[PDB]
């Protein structure tokens, strides 16, 4: 690993600099190096890891969608034949996206999840596992599509089970997990009713627990609750 010679603390320091510079590929490579030191990650470090890969894969997904839309248009009636280039380049971007997803899933499997015993760390990593299987599912069209979808569902479900047992309904990780699992139901699993039910129940249960929070925790929770409401508004 190219980061094998760099101190763990230096990798973390550089990940933070990369974030400030909006250099998310570098940020992800630094955090990968930090994970591969083999020590557990603190809360702040888990956030750096997630932020870096979310931003790298988010850019890839946006580009994939642009290319997929052009490719779809090419296969409509009366569209002029322009050769294999659009498919080839969509495939190139797709393969790079899959690679990044496989890299994140590999970090989670070797060995972040197995060493994560506290509810906050284990739920956070399982949410990530669901997320990266969901991104794999978005581009899957083959024999394994059902298994990729099921892997996303399974990770999200284990995270939900732990979160409901161990965390308050306003916890930002519980909220963010539910938000994303609801989107999985709507966009991936063809289950819009399940998506709407989950977003509503999560929002309402959080509402009822806001009274227990400090001002700062209230701000943190309500920010994510608004996204649940935004999705509900989109869907109804």
């Amino acid at each position: 690993g190219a980061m094998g010679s760099m101190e763990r603390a230096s990798l973390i320091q550089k990940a933070k600099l990369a974030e400030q510079a909006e250099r998310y590929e570098d940020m992800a490579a630094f955090m990968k190096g930090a994970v591969e030191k083999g020590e557990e990650l603190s809360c702040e470090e888990r956030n750096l890891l997630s932020v870096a890969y979310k931003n790298v894969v988010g850019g890839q997904r946006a580009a994939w969608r642009v290319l997929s839309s052009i490719e779809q248009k090419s296969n409509e009636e009366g569209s002029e034949e322009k050769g294999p280039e659009v498919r080839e380049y969509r495939e190139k971007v797709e393969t790079e996206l899959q690679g990044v997803c496989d890299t994140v899933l590999g970090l989670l499997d070797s060995h972040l999840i197995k060493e994560a015993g506290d509810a906050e760390s284990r739920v956070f990593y399982l949410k990530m596992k669901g997320d990266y299987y969901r991104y794999l599912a978005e581009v899957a069209t083959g024999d394994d599509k059902k298994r990729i979808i099921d892997s996303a569902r399974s990770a999200y479900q284990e995270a939900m089970d732990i979160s409901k047992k161990e965390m308050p309904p306003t916890n930002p990780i519980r909220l963010g997990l539910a938000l994303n699992f609801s989107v999985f139901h709507y966009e991936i699993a063809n289950s819009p009713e399940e998506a709407i039910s989950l977003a509503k129940t999560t929002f309402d249960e959080a509402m009822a627990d806001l009274h227990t929070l400090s001002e700062d925790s209230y701000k943190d929770s309500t920010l994510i609750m608004q996204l649940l409401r935004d999705n509900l508004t989109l869907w109804t």
Partner: peptide, 5 residues
Amino acid sequence: FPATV
């Protein structure tokens, strides 16, 4: 697209 975090 819907919101995720």
